[PDB]
């Protein structure tokens, strides 16, 4: 299983599944928006070589909602 995910600034995440192949998504906090080009996704992938799983590195960037 994957360890807890890293924290992203101005975002939260509630992981439903920590098992390998699981796909979870961060959610930018109210007042903030996922920057275009960045992803809210992280997937739990296994290192077959060592049997240790880890979350893929997120590219997410939460910026101030331009409409506010």
């Amino acid at each position: 299983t994957c360890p807890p995910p890293v924290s992203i600034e101005h975002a939260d995440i509630r992981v439903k599944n920590y098992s390998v192949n699981s796909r979870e998504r961060y959610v930018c906090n109210s007042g903030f928006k996922r920057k275009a080009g960045t992803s809210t996704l992280i997937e739990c992938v296994i290192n077959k070589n060592t049997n240790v799983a880890h979350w893929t590195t997120p590219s997410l960037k939460c910026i101030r909602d331009p409409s506010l």
């Binding site: 796909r23 928006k33 996922r34 920057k35 275009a36 080009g37 960045t38 992803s39 996704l41 590219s59 910026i63 909602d65 331009p66 409409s67």
Partner: protein, 117 residues
């Protein structure tokens, strides 16, 4: 320029076919109400959002194809470049749509570019 936009649209059409056999749970900023006034701004938002697909999926052909779209689209916007636009919305204030709807609008704006190329 229209020749370049033709290749771009053919790639987008290919992606439509490709994702018929790929689970896609990505939602992206989609500007279906794009206008000539802010056409370059809108195109750049479509192009920028593609990088999201590249980050979320490892499917080889899909990756090569979306990357192929970026290379050509950026090259064209770079080569045959024009004015600078104003009074245009930021990408983050567009509504998010399923990848399928994002692609359909992407194909429509590229068609606009072809028609006025």
């Amino acid at each position: 320029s229209s020749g370049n936009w033709i290749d771009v649209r053919y790639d987008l059409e290919k992606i439509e076919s490709l994702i018929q056999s790929i689970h896609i749970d990505t939602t992206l900023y989609t500007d279906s109400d794009f206008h000539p006034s802010c056409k370059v701004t809108a195109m750049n938002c479509f192009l920028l959002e593609l990088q999201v697909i590249l980050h979320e999926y490892s499917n080889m052909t899909l990756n090569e194809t979306v990357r192929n779209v970026l290379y050509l689209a950026n090259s064209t916007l770079s080569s045959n470049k024009n004015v600078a636009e104003s009074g245009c919305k930021e990408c983050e204030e567009l509504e998010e749509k399923t990848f399928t709807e994002f692609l359909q609008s992407f194909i429509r704006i590229v068609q606009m570019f072809i028609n006025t190329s």
